[PDB]
Amino acid sequence: NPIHDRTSDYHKYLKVKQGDSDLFKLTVSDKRYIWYNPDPKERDSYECGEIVSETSDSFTFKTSDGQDRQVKKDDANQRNPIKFDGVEDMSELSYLNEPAVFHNLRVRYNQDLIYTYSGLFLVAVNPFKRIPIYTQEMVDIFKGRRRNEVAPHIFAISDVAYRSMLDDRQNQSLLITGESGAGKTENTKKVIQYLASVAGRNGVLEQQILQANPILEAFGNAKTTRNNNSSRFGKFIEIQFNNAGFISGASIQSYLLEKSRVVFQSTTERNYHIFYQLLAGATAEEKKALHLAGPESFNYLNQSGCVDIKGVSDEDEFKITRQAMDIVGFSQEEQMSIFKIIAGILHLGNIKFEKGAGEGAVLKDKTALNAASTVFGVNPSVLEKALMEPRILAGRDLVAQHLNVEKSSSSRDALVKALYGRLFLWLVKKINNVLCSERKAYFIGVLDISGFEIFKVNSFEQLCINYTNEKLQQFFNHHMFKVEQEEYLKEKINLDSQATIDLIDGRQPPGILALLDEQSVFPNATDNTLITKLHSHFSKKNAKYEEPRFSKTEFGVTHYAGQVMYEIQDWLEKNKDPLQQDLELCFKDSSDNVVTKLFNDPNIASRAFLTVAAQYKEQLASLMATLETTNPHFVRCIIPNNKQLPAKLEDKVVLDQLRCNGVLEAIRITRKGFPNRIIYADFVKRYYDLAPNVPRDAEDSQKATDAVLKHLNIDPEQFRFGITKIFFRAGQLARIEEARE
Ligand SMILES: Nc1ncnc2c1ncn2[C@@H]1O[C@H](COP(=O)(O)OP(=O)(O)OP(O)(O)=S)[C@@H](O)[C@H]1O
Numbered sequence: 002n003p004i005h006d007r008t009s010d011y012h013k014y015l016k017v018k019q020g021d022s023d024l025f026k027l028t029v030s031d032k033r034y035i036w037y038n039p040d041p042k043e044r045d046s047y048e049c050g051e052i053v054s055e056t057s058d059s060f061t062f063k064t065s066d067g068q069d070r071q072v073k074k075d076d077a078n079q080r081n082p083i084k085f086d087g088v089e090d091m092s093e094l095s096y097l098n099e100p101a102v103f104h105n106l107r108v109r110y111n112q113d114l115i116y117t118y119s120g121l122f123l124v125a126v127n128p129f130k131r132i133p134i135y136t137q138e139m140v141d142i143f144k145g146r147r148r149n150e151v152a153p154h155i156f157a158i159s160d161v162a163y164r165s166m167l168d169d170r171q172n173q174s175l176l177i178t179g180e181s182g183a184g185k186t187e188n189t190k191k192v193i194q195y196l197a198s199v200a201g202r203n204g205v206l207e208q209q210i211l212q213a214n215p216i217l218e219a220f221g222n223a224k225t226t227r228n229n230n231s232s233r234f235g236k237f238i239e240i241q242f243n244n245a246g247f248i249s250g251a252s253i254q255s256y257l258l259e260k261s262r263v264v265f266q267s268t269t270e271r272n273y274h275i276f277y278q279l280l281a282g283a284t285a286e287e288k289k290a291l292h293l294a295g296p297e298s299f300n301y302l303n304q305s306g307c308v309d310i311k312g313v314s315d316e317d318e319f320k321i322t323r324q325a326m327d328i329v330g331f332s333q334e335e336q337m338s339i340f341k342i343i344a345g346i347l348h349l350g351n352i353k354f355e356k357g358a359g360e361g362a363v364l365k366d367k368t369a370l371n372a373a374s375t376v377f378g379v380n381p382s383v384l385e386k387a388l389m390e391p392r393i394l395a396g397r398d399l400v401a402q403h404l405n406v407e408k409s410s411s412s413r414d415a416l417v418k419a420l421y422g423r424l425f426l427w428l429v430k431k432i433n434n435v436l437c438s439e440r441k442a443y444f445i446g447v448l449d450i451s452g453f454e455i456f457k458v459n460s461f462e463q464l465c466i467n468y469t470n471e472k473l474q475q476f477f478n479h480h481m482f483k484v485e486q487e488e489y490l491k492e493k494i495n496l497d498s499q500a501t502i503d504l505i506d507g508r509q510p511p512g513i514l515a516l517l518d519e520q521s522v523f524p525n526a527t528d529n530t531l532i533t534k535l536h537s538h539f540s541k542k543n544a545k546y547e548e549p550r551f552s553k554t555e556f557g558v559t560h561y562a563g564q565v566m567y568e569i570q571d572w573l574e575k576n577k578d579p580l581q582q583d584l585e586l587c588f589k590d591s592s593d594n595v596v597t598k599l600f601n602d603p604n605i606a607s608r609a610f611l612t613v614a615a616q617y618k619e620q621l622a623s624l625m626a627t628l629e630t631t632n633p634h635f636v637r638c639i640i641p642n643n644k645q646l647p648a649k650l651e652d653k654v655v656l657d658q659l660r661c662n663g664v665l666e667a668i669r670i671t672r673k674g675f676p677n678r679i680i681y682a683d684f685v686k687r688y689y690d691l692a693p694n695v696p697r698d699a700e701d702s703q704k705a706t707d708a709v710l711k712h713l714n715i716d717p718e719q720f721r722f723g724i725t726k727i728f729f730r731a732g733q734l735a736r737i738e739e740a741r742e
């Protein structure tokens with residue numbers, strides 16, 4: 002029993018190493034400490050200062066430099082006793098301040114212990130290196146063990162959810178959020194891995210389930226500056242089980258795919274993997290059949306400067322990709338056609354428009370055009386026309402407009418994005434067909450989406466994601482509320498979100514999105530019309546809104562995680578997500594069997610006519626609706642720094658994450674009440690010695706508990722006698738720990 006075998010890798014990689022003695026005395030020390038900032042400017046940089054003395058109302062300690070300072074007792078960030086260093090649950094700390102929470106986390110991360118509970122949450126810090134804790138043998142250990150029975154681990158959370166499901170006959174949810182490169186995806190794959198093993202048919206379906214990711218990642222993931230394998234879409238995976246607890250199916254829901262990246266990538270970034278997998282993996286044969294070339298040869302791949310990922314083989318990845326398509330069950334035809342699309346898009350990107358003639362655009366060279374049309378199976382001349390001379394409705398009239406160069410270009414780009422986005426939807430639906438069960442008994446859904454996003458530039462998509470985030474945070478808070486309430490009750494112990502939410506999605510008065518939809522009808526509205534209307538309704542009128550002192554194209558929202566400034570450029574376009582009808586016509590006719598789908602199926606070809614914002618709001622609401630039906634589990638993934646490096650846990654970086662993600666809030670809140678809630682028996686074991694009275698092992702543990710306390714002459718308001726646990730307010734237990742044997 003590896004859990005008891007101090008020599009196992011379980012013990013090596015998942016636990017704080019244990020010595021021979023457990024004796025209370027070892028940890029004996031006379032010294033007391035505080036967490037201080039050696040620069041009040043840099044607020045997340047603390048040092049530990051021993052406390053030299055105290056006053057009736059303050060503390061006076063010595064800094065690192067031998068420098069002495071004074072602090073208000075009431076402002077002190079007291080350091081937990083060393084015994085607490087490395088606890089598995091932050092909920093176990095007596096002093097629950099910020100430097101303190103960070104310190105426990107860091108102690109743990111320094112031993113490569115990346116998972117730590119914080120009440121209801123599982124906090125996970127990206128190690129940025131391999132830790133062999135995801136083996137089958139590792140899977141095997143977590144089977145049927147209570148949270149409190151094993152070390153923190155994604156597997157653990159997964160096991161709790163699965164037993165809960167079987168036990169309570171209730172659906173469950175695992176919400177894995179955090180920033181780019183934080184490890185959401187990695188953890189998501191481990192949850193599925195785990196389920197697949199604990200509940201799989203001891204597997205074909207299990208295989209197809211697994212192989213679905215890989216497929217999605219090729220088309221929806223890319224190299225960005227924050228992550229070599231960034232998910233440029235959000236997802237909600239539903240793992241379906243039958244009444245007996247065996248995996249019966251699955252369904253996936255995708256959100257917010259970054260279609261833009263298809264036509265543009267920032268420097269050092271790559272387009273989606275697939276492009277490169279195809280280009281490096283196609284047979285010298287398919288190449289020619291696809292008119293393929295290097296990446297350097299394609300405008301959509303030759304701009305970021307980056308065409309390769311360190312320690313990554315696109316060709317090798319292609320195989321893999323192609324392999325999964327196989328498993329899931331994509332026909333060769335389908336497969337070819339999918340490639341053909343990937344290919345055509347590449348060709349479209351290579352279309353050069355020139356002017357001269359007059360002002361309208363022209364295609365002096367038709368090579369690219371020919372190639373794209375060819376692969377798509379559409380008519381080049383029709384394509385040509387639909388791109389540069391779209392017929393447009395002036396009411397009665399349906400007249401062809403001759404587009405200029407840029408406009409022509411923007412249209413081809415729009416075609417490309419629709420192709421990509423639609424193909425992605427189609428892949429998803431294809432997989433679901435295969436995997437999904439109409440009739441299922443239970444499910445455990447996993448959400449793998451970004452947490453709050455606050456970049457340099459925040460656009461429409463950031464607002465969306467941040468809106469989702471407000472909803473999930475408010476979901477957490479409500480949950481936390483019942484759960485925390487349930488508990489006190491069981492032992493016999495005694496919003497702002499809404500306003501932000503309304504600001505965004507309100508119908509009356511109208512919020513940001515309703516105004517944006519309104520502006521959306523008018524062909525002639527502009528980003529200026531839009532932003533002016535926004536300021537007209539909320540500047541000094543809604544407390545969550547801020548009109549900037551000088552910018553004319555931005556506005557701020559006070560979000561849960563703090564203010565975000567958004568820039569309004571292109572929102573109208575984004576909101577409508579326009580594609581010329583002649584382009585729809587052109588492609589509808591596609592000889593291609595798959596192409597035909599992308600344009601002929603309203604479930605793929607269209608939104609409903611709904612705006613992009615309306616659709617987003619609608620999908621978020623179903624989402625939450627579903628979640629409302631489950632028993633949720635929260636995973637907070639934390640990036641340790643901005644460099645993709647191991648052994649480099651940056652306080653500022655980290656602290657920031659903890660503030661925004663609800664971890665520090667939960668605590669502050671928990672802190673307020675009775676944070677420490679110990680099993681009577683557990684208390685006594687550790688403290689019997691402190692009282693000229695009590696024996697380590699007593700059957701009357703509550704009584705034994707009242708002894709030490711009394712021995713100790715501890716304050717009654719500082720602790721609450723719970724049926725099973727002893728509830729200790731903040732610092733109390735630290736003091737107690739701080740007592741003589
Ligand atoms: N437990 C882990 N062990 C080792 N590496 C990990 C672990 N979790 C994440 N990583 C590393 O971190 C990288 C990025 O993590 P991801 O799981 O892709 O992040 P993410 O939160 O999905 O980020 P996005 O998709 O950009 S919002 C991985 O590809 C690994 O290098």
Ligand SMILES: [Mg+2]
Pocket residue numbers: 185186187230231232
């Ligand atoms: Mg991801």
